[PDB]
Design a protein around this nucleic acid. Structure first.
Length: 402
RNA sequence: UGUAAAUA
């Protein structure tokens, strides 16, 4: 409970309290971990403070290592820590240089243990984006280099610290993270994780030369391009493992979907998806990758993808069903055929550009459309029993009347 | 007919 001097006749905290009564009391730690007490502290802290009130606040909250961690790891104290940090960064007295290098020492001492903590992880992120950049970078160097970094990316709380590091720190200071993920054995465990799959995507987004990186120098673009390729080369060598994974399929989709990654989207399709379209279309998670490939492939690779589905597999020696018959009725493959039909119809309707590579590839979309149109025409009775077939039939009819 | 993130 709170200190006995701070309660009233009925055991509840007295009204009309001041900030220096508790600061002079030396009982701030009792106030910071109580809900009502910390509710009063963090509101009296947002008001105008004297230079000595800040002096007491800095020493009592971020002045001792053990007491600082005890508040950062506390459900209530972690909020008071973050506000005192902002006052330390807004008070340019003498102790400004000593206070945050001292604060950097306290978290670098307990880096991993704090990211894995549910409440201390917020002190890492807030200090990463609010401290001086020169000191926020030395914080990133405190990250482990061994198996503890794998546990940090896959942690429910610690994964956001790395996503924060990627967001507010220049790449050079966390370039080692890219290589730690780039190594084959670590790439498997992290991409296959519920939270690690999000970490990998966030790294690629910052490593992408899109509109959110036009402020970089070309020297910074070269360093980004070096880390970009290095990560892609590992991902593409393990692409089939990542494409069929529950979580890692979102990374192969993110690469193929992005126009600013078209150089690597073409390498995913050619060295992993090609010659495996029928197989990957029947996989629960890889079928989403197959859809994104059809939607975002360049028209030359799109032709080889179409021709593979239409004429890349031997028909069944007894029934005679080709890959089109198999996919149209498959529990997952039917969406891929629906993706092919939507693309072809979007092209002949003006909803999709047909000029690419200095030529109008319209005649090929019409060619692919006739193939689908006649298979749906010939199998209209068997397709009408399925939800997938009813949408293919009405799509062709809706296009007919345009 | 088919899938994903943590504080009062």
């Amino acid at each position: 409970v709170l200190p006995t001097w701070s309660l009233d006749s009925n055991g509840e905290m007295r009204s009309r309290l001041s900030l220096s009564e508790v600061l002079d009391s030396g009982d701030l730690m009792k106030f910071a971990v109580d809900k009502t007490g910390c509710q009063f502290l963090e509101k009296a802290v947002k008001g105008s403070l004297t230079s000595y009130q800040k002096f007491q606040l800095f020493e009592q909250v971020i002045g001792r290592k053990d007491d600082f961690l005890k508040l950062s790891t506390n459900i209530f104290g972690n909020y008071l820590v973050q506000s005192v940090i902002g006052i330390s960064l807004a008070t340019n007295d003498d102790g400004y240089t000593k206070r945050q290098e001292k604060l950097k020492n306290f978290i670098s001492s307990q880096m991993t243990d704090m990211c894995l903590d549910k409440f201390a992880c917020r002190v890492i992120q807030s200090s990463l984006q609010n401290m001086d950049l020169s000191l926020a970078c030395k914080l990133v160097q405190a990250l482990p280099r061994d198996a503890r970094l794998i546990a940090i990316c896959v942690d429910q709380n610690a994964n956001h610290v790395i996503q924060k590091v990627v967001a507010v720190i220049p790449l050079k200071n966390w370039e080692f993270i890219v290589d730690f993920v780039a190594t084959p054995e670590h790439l498997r465990q992290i991409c296959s994780d519920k939270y690690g799959a999000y970490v990998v995507q966030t790294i690629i987004e910052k490593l992408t030369a899109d509109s959110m990186n036009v402020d970089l120098t070309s020297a910074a673009q070269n360093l980004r391009e070096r880390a970009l390729q290095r990560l892609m080369t590992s991902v593409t060598n393990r692409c089939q493992e990542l494409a069929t994974n529950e979580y890692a399929n979102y990374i192969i989709q993110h690469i193929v979907s992005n126009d600013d990654l078209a150089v690597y989207r073409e390498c995913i399709i050619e060295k992993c998806l090609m010659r495996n379209l029928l197989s990957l279309s029947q996989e629960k998670f890889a079928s989403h990758v197959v859809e994104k490939a059809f939607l975002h492939a360049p028209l030359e690779l799109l032709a080889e993808m179409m021709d593979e589905i239409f004429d890349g597999y031997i028909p069944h020696p007894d029934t005679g069903k080709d890959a089109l018959d198999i996919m149209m009725f498959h529990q997952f493959g039917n969406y891929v055929v629906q993706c092919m039909l939507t693309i072809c119809c979007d092209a002949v309707s003006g909803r999709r550009q047909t000029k690419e590579g200095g030529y109008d590839h319209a005649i090929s979309f019409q060619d692919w459309l006739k193939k689908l149109h006649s298979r749906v025409t010939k199998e209209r009775h068997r397709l009408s029993r399925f939800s997938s077939g009813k949408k293919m039939i009405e799509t062709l009819a809706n296009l007919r009347s345009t």
